Design a protein around this ligand. Structure first.
Ligand SMILES: [Cl-]
Length: 252
């Protein structure tokens, strides 16, 4: 399977900087990870370049690992390279609902750790609602759907309660971003940090500028719109504000 991606050239901190736009693959982890490294100027593309294969994207990412090498790192780099192909053949990312950096460990955590790129989500139980805090506890998404099923079958009333309360949480927060998650993300990401944001099995490049969270606009529809670079993340539901590469509102 050969995939081709269109490169958008933007002015990022007053320097000519490429971003990879999504094709049929959509907002896959590979684009979100690459775009962090391109914006950080840790990977440079040829100034010509308009188009790039998934294969070349992979070569660039693996070359960046051998170049950023500073015996066991060899194993980890090799394991990361094998795992790196899962970044195109599905990533099973499993959040916990207790913190913006908390996920169930899967071997793909090897890639983010070796690349030293932070991974975040904002699917967070509101700590002010005690029955949800207790019902969800430390569950991963996958553990909670299992807990719901087990707990509804229980002869113990309390456990049947936690089951229904956990189901209510999943139904009511099905967008996979909560207001509390958005607040914890905003205060946790540092000014100018480049990072990956996980929501609804989609990966986005995220930054913070003057206290405000933005997602990099990767949608193919905006390839020639130089003034659409960032989208504000300021609410759980509805569209953010489209901004240029300097975070100013795109004129209507
Ligand atoms: Cl800036």
């Amino acid at each position: 399977f050969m995939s081709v991606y269109h490169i958008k050239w933007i002015q990022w901190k007053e320097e000519n900087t490429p971003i990879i736009t999504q094709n049929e693959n959509g907002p896959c982890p590979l684009l979100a990870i690459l775009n962090v490294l391109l914006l950080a100027w840790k990977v440079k593309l040829p100034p010509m370049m308009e188009i790039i294969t998934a294969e070349q994207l992979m070569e660039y990412l693996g070359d960046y690992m051998l170049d950023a090498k500073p015996l066991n790192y060899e194993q980890n780099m090799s394991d990361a390279m094998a795992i790196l192909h899962k970044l195109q053949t599905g990533l099973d990312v499993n959040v916990r609902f207790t913190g913006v950096r908390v996920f169930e460990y899967t071997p793909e955590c090897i890639v983010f750790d070796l690349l030293d790129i932070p991974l975040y989500h904002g699917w967070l139980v509101d700590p002010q609602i005690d029955d949800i805090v207790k019902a969800v506890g430390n569950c991963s998404y996958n553990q909670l759907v299992e807990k719901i099923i087990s707990c509804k079958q229980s002869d113990n009333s309390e456990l049947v309660s936690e089951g229904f309360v956990a189901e209510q949480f999943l139904n009511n927060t099905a967008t996979q971003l909560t207001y509390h998650g958005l607040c914890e993300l905003t205060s946790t990401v540092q000014e100018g940090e480049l990072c990956v944001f996980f929501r609804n099995n989609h990966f986005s490049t995220m930054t913070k500028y003057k206290g405000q969270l933005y997602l990099l606009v990767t949608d193919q529809g905006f390839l020639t719109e130089e003034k659409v670079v960032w989208e504000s993340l300021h609410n759980v539901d509805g569209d953010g504000n489209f901004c240029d590469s300097e975070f100013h509102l795109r004129p209507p």
